[PDB]
Amino acid sequence: TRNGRDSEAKRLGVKRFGGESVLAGSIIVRQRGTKFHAGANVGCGRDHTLFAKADGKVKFEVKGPKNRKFISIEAE
Amino acid sequence: AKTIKITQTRSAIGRLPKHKATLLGLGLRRIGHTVEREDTPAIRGMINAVSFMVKVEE
Amino acid sequence: MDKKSARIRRATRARRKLQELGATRLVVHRTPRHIYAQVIAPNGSEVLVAASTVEKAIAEQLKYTGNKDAAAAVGKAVAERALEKGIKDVSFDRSGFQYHGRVQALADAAREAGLQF
Amino acid sequence: MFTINAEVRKEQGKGASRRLRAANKFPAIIYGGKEAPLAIELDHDKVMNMQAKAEFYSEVLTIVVDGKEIKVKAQDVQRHPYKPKLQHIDFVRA
Amino acid sequence: MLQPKRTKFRKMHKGRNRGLAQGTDVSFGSFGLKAVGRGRLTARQIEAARRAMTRAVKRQGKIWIRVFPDKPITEKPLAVRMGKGKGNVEYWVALIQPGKVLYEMDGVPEELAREAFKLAAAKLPIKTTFVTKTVM
RNA sequence: UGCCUGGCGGCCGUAGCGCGGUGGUCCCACCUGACCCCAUGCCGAACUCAGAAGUGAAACGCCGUAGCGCCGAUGGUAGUGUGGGGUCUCCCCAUGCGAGAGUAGGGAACUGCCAGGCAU
RNA sequence: GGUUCUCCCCGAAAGCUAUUUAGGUAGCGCCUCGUGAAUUCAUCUCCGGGGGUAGAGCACUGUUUCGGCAAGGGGGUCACUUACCAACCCGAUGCAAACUGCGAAUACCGGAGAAUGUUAUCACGGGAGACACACGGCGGGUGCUAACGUCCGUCGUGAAGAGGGAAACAACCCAGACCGCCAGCUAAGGUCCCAAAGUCAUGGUUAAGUGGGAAACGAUGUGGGAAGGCCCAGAC
RNA sequence: CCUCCUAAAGAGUAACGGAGGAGCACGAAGGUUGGCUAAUCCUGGUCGGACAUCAGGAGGUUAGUGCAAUGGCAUAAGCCA
RNA sequence: GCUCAACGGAUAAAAGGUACUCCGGGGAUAACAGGCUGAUACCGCCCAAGAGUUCAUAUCGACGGCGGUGUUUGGCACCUC
Ligand SMILES: [Mg+2]
Ligand SMILES: [Mg+2]
Ligand SMILES: [Mg+2]
Ligand SMILES: [Mg+2]
Ligand SMILES: [Mg+2]
Ligand SMILES: [Mg+2]
Ligand SMILES: [Mg+2]
Ligand SMILES: [Mg+2]
Ligand SMILES: [Mg+2]
Ligand SMILES: [Mg+2]
Ligand SMILES: [Mg+2]
Ligand SMILES: [Mg+2]
Ligand SMILES: [Mg+2]
Ligand SMILES: [Mg+2]
Ligand SMILES: [Mg+2]
Ligand SMILES: [Mg+2]
Ligand SMILES: [Mg+2]
Ligand SMILES: [Mg+2]
Ligand SMILES: [Mg+2]
Ligand SMILES: [Mg+2]
Ligand SMILES: [Mg+2]
Ligand SMILES: [Mg+2]
Ligand SMILES: [Mg+2]
Ligand SMILES: [Mg+2]
Ligand SMILES: [Mg+2]
Ligand SMILES: [Mg+2]
Ligand SMILES: [Mg+2]
Ligand SMILES: [Mg+2]
Ligand SMILES: [Mg+2]
Ligand SMILES: [Mg+2]
Ligand SMILES: [Mg+2]
Ligand SMILES: [Mg+2]
Ligand SMILES: [Mg+2]
Ligand SMILES: [Mg+2]
Ligand SMILES: [Mg+2]
Numbered sequence: 001t002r003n004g005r006d007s008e009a010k011r012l013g014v015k016r017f018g019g020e021s022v023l024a025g026s027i028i029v030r031q032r033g034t035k036f037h038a039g040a041n042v043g044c045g046r047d048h049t050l051f052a053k054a055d056g057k058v059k060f061e062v063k064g065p066k067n068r069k070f071i072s073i074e075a076e
Numbered sequence: 077a078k079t080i081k082i083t084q085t086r087s088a089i090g091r092l093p094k095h096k097a098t099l100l101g102l103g104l105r106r107i108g109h110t111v112e113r114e115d116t117p118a119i120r121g122m123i124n125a126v127s128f129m130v131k132v133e134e
Numbered sequence: 135m136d137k138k139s140a141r142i143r144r145a146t147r148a149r150r151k152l153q154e155l156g157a158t159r160l161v162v163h164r165t166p167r168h169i170y171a172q173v174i175a176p177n178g179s180e181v182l183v184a185a186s187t188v189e190k191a192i193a194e195q196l197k198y199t200g201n202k203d204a205a206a207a208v209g210k211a212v213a214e215r216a217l218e219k220g221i222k223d224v225s226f227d228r229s230g231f232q233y234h235g236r237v238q239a240l241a242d243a244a245r246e247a248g249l250q251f
Numbered sequence: 252m253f254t255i256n257a258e259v260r261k262e263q264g265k266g267a268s269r270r271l272r273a274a275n276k277f278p279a280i281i282y283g284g285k286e287a288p289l290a291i292e293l294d295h296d297k298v299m300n301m302q303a304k305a306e307f308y309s310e311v312l313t314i315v316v317d318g319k320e321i322k323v324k325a326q327d328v329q330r331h332p333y334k335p336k337l338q339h340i341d342f343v344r345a
Numbered sequence: 346m347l348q349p350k351r352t353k354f355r356k357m358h359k360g361r362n363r364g365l366a367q368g369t370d371v372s373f374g375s376f377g378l379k380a381v382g383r384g385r386l387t388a389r390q391i392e393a394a395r396r397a398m399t400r401a402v403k404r405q406g407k408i409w410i411r412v413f414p415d416k417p418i419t420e421k422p423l424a425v426r427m428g429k430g431k432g433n434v435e436y437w438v439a440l441i442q443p444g445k446v447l448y449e450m451d452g453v454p455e456e457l458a459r460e461a462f463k464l465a466a467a468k469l470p471i472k473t474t475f476v477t478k479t480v481m
Numbered sequence: 482u483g484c485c486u487g488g489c490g491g492c493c494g495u496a497g498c499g500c501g502g503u504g505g506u507c508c509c510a511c512c513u514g515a516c517c518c519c520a521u522g523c524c525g526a527a528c529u530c531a532g533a534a535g536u537g538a539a540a541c542g543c544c545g546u547a548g549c550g551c552c553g554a555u556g557g558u559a560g561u562g563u564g565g566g567g568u569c570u571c572c573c574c575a576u577g578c579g580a581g582a583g584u585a586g587g588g589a590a591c592u593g594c595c596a597g598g599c600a601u
Numbered sequence: 602g603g604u605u606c607u608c609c610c611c612g613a614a615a616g617c618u619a620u621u622u623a624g625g626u627a628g629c630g631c632c633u634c635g636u637g638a639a640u641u642c643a644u645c646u647c648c649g650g651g652g653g654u655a656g657a658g659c660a661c662u663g664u665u666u667c668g669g670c671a672a673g674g675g676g677g678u679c680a681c682u683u684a685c686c687a688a689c690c691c692g693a694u695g696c697a698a699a700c701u702g703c704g705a706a707u708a709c710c711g712g713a714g715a716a717u718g719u720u721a722u723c724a725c726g727g728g729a730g731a732c733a734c735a736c737g738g739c740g741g742g743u744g745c746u747a748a749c750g751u752c753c754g755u756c757g758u759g760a761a762g763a764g765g766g767a768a769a770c771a772a773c774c775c776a777g778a779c780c781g782c783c784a785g786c787u788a789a790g791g792u793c794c795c796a797a798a799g800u801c802a803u804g805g806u807u808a809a810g811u812g813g814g815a816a817a818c819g820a821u822g823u824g825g826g827a828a829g830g831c832c833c834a835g836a837c
Numbered sequence: 838c839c840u841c842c843u844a845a846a847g848a849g850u851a852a853c854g855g856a857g858g859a860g861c862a863c864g865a866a867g868g869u870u871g872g873c874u875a876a877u878c879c880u881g882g883u884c885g886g887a888c889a890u891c892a893g894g895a896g897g898u899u900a901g902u903g904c905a906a907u908g909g910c911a912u913a914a915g916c917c918a
Numbered sequence: 919g920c921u922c923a924a925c926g927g928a929u930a931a932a933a934g935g936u937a938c939u940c941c942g943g944g945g946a947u948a949a950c951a952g953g954c955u956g957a958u959a960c961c962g963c964c965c966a967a968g969a970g971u972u973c974a975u976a977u978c979g980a981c982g983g984c985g986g987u988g989u990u991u992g993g994c995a996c997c998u999c
Binding site: 387389390392394396397400420421423425426427463464466467468470 | 958966991993994
């Protein structure tokens with residue numbers, strides 16, 4: 001039947017890019033699935049939000065046999 | 077470094093905002109304004125963005 | 135899945151969690167004929183201490199290399215060698231095998247000998 | 252025996268290649284072997300009338316780059332989308 | 346009359362028809378009818394041209410149609426204001442960029458293929474050229 | 482020090498698949514037995530325990546091999562930021578950036594810790 | 602609808618959100634005044650990032666044509682067979698906003714550094730206006746790649762901007778007017794006369810007043826270029 | 838209110854633009870420990886057929902996810918105790 | 919304990935008629951005419967299967983193609999409420 005509907009934009013995406021200094025707890029990426037996976041010092045929330053578990057620099061990296069994206073936190 | 081002279085050659089009217097920001101970065105005020113600046117790559121980057129409207133004398 | 139691949143799959147989750155926690159792990163390997171034990175540093179690329187039934191010094195005082203008694207011997211051996219190098223706190227990695235029989239005998243022996251897990 | 256005259260390219264890229272075509276000339280490449288690939292320019296009319304003959308794509312051709320002679324074979328041809336013109340030729344060392 | 350048998354979606358955004366064609370070579374027959382222009386070919390134009398060239402070769406040889414009208418075209422009727430939803434699909438077009446080989450033929454002498462293509466070209470909204478098969 | 486094997490990693494197809502060959506003293510595997518520890522929505526297949534009569538058949542490791550995967554230039558082409566222009570649905574020029582596909586070619590992995598067998 | 606003396610400084614908006622709201626109002630955005638605070642902010646350079654867009658491609662999701670091979674459906678059997686149709690698979694060829702085994706240019710986030718910029722930045726407090734936008738460029742949706750149409754994004758100008766050019770002509774091009782000058786140089790655009798400046802120089806093209814409106818298509822119009830067929834064994 | 842595209846590769850972005858869905862369910866369909874791995878096609882097999890259950894091979898997640906879409910998911914987030 | 923779903927919810931509580939009409943406003947917004955546009959319309963051409971005993975173009979002309987006008991049916995809401 002008729003169209004006309006759409007939902008509110010969920011403001012997902014990368015909140016802190018590579019090199020950015022973050023304090024423990026800071027959301028690095030809001031995503032729907034695990035487009036990025038949690039690496040060293042990075043936690044994964046119930047809505048697959050990746051967050052900092054320790055103060056430091058955001059590091060993006062491709063690891064493993066499945067060539068997956070990982071967000072980690074390097075000490076600064 | 078060495079000193080160079082830059083002169084605005086065309087009007088800033090109608091130019092992209094970023095280009096107006098660049099002319100402010102060079103301290104160029106009006107058409108024909110010649111200015112003495114240090115020949116560094118940062119000054120040479122600014123000159124390059126607004127190349128169409130400045131003349132350089134080395 | 136074939137026996138080996140099926141076992142590695144069974145072992146992957148715990149090993150990744152141990153990697154994440156940065157824990158020193160006591161890795162056990164089992165075979166019909168032999169039982170092995172290695173204490174691997176959190177990096178996972180270097181062995182601190184090891185003991186097995188392929189070792190002439192251990193197999194000599196044992197009836198059969200692939201039984202619960204041999205497993206208890208390998209267990210006592212790693213813990214003793216680990217404690218001589220100052221390694222006290224570890225995390226047991228059953229490596230896809232059930233925590234039972236031979237694997238259990240090795241872990242109960244290491245616990246007895248003084249290893250903390 | 253097809254004999255193609257060529258000069259070495261003093262420039263490379265979009266700007267420079269388009270300037271050749273406007274000047275009734277076209278870029279081409281010579282590659283293969285231990286030797287480094289040679290970026291060359293060809294006269295459009297001359298090569299165009301040559302490639303009209305089926306033998307051009309089968310036979311071993313000789314490219315004359317500043318005196319020197321190079322035995323090659325036509326590897327690939329980039330033609331104009333709708334005009335009877337040549338855009339670029341790949342020559343492989345024979 | 347050519348048309349997709351089924352489609353994921355009924356209607357499609359207008360879009361643009363920029364760039365040069367893909368499929369610029371006689372890949373199946375001996376001769377071709379290449380587009381020199383840019384435009385849309387309707388399913389009716391494609392059929393009209395196909396019929397003309399077929400009659401020309403007296404249904405000898407083989408014909409290939411390298412284009413497919415997979416683009417749905419909508420239209421608002423008379424006495425209808427703007428808005429109130431996208432119009433209804435009326436016809437199907439194939440976007441044509443310069444270089445597209447539209448039709449291919451073989452099994453006929455060059456002179457005949459040239460005439461057949463001259464006759465079909467007159468039914469098309471865009472400028473064409475006769476093309477022959479090439480060795481690479 | 483060399484060769485071989487097992488474990489745990491690095492790396493994540495130049496590393497994989499296929500095809501051919503090859504290895505059992507040791508290791509590994511199949512294997513033997515099963516009342517029992519333990520197990521099967523049934524089954525000792527798997528999990529598991531007690532072993533050593535047999536075999537490298539399978540698997541696994543190694544060696545070879547470009548059928549496939551994979552890596553991949555150079556050159557040209559497509560696009561595009563800025564400035565300019567035309568016949569302005571689309572293009573062109575100056576300048577900077579510059580693919581994707583294809584082509585030549587590469588390619589039958591490389592590497593660390595520990596342990597065991599053998600040899601000098 | 603109207604709102605009355607003067608000069609000076611700064612200087613918007615026609616957006617978002619909510620609204621019995623839609624030509625009203627409120628918070629935020631943007632303006633102004635004040636207080637305070639860091640090299641706070643901008644440009645550029647070098648360094649650290651994530652893209653899935655343009656383009657491309659066709660393994661995936663669909664769609665599409667040709668060839669090869671073919672389970673299966675339709676008609677004769679009284680299981681066998683056929684000038685039919687034919688998914689999958691292989692080779693070849695395209696198409697995609699809601700396809701991606703690829704993938705830019707830009708843009709954006711972060712770090713450091715200089716120069717420049719009347720703090721341009723942030724916070725708090727006083728005072729607002731404004732929430733009808735318009736055209737032009739680029740990227741799109743809608744419509745007919747119709748509209749001086751309509752709806753987003755982004756930049757420019759008008760709005761709130763005079764001067765020169767585009768005959769005239771908010772929104773295009775050049776350029777931002779504190780005041781005086783019967784000085785000079787330039788921009789866009791121009792230089793035969795109206796009308797300031799070349800009846801300038803040099804080399805070509807056109808003969809249509811083309812220039813100074815318009816397409817498919819048509820034609821021994823004329824200039825340049827590369828090739829070819831026939832021909833003194835006599836071509837046209 | 839939710840999902841995708843329009844949306845111009847950060848976020849956001851309009852129209853009576855293009856397509857769909859929600860106004861619930863579940864004491865297990867939640868927690869944990871231990872285990873397990875689909876779709877589809879080919880071959881063989883009582884009744885049994887194009888398709889039920891059984892066996893082997895190819896395949897490799899195209900399946901599955903209480904439900905729309907998109908992003909995820911094998912260390913499974915899928916399936917069992 | 920509200921499908922206060924008009925979902926930031928005016929009340930616990932509410933449908934219509936006016937050609938008998940009235941006021942404040944708007945060309946912010948329709949009807950006439952102008953304007954922009956030209957899908958539609960009207961006029962012309964390009965191609966030529968075929969009709970025309972024979973022969974495409976005497977006269978016509980299918981499948982399709984390109985324009986001109988501002989001129990019908992419309993679109994828009996720029997001018998005048
Ligand atoms: Mg360029
Ligand atoms: Mg067994
Ligand atoms: Mg073997
Ligand atoms: Mg490059
Ligand atoms: Mg690249
Ligand atoms: Mg490439
Ligand atoms: Mg490739
Ligand atoms: Mg090779
Ligand atoms: Mg050794
Ligand atoms: Mg001011
Ligand atoms: Mg209300
Ligand atoms: Mg960088
Ligand atoms: Mg595209
Ligand atoms: Mg086929
Ligand atoms: Mg303030
Ligand atoms: Mg309002
Ligand atoms: Mg408004
Ligand atoms: Mg607007
Ligand atoms: Mg308008
Ligand atoms: Mg106003
Ligand atoms: Mg004037
Ligand atoms: Mg004069
Ligand atoms: Mg005229
Ligand atoms: Mg004669
Ligand atoms: Mg976005
Ligand atoms: Mg963007
Ligand atoms: Mg579940
Ligand atoms: Mg588990
Ligand atoms: Mg069967
Ligand atoms: Mg409301
Ligand atoms: Mg009244
Ligand atoms: Mg009006
Ligand atoms: Mg009217
Ligand atoms: Mg309007
Ligand atoms: Mg009027």
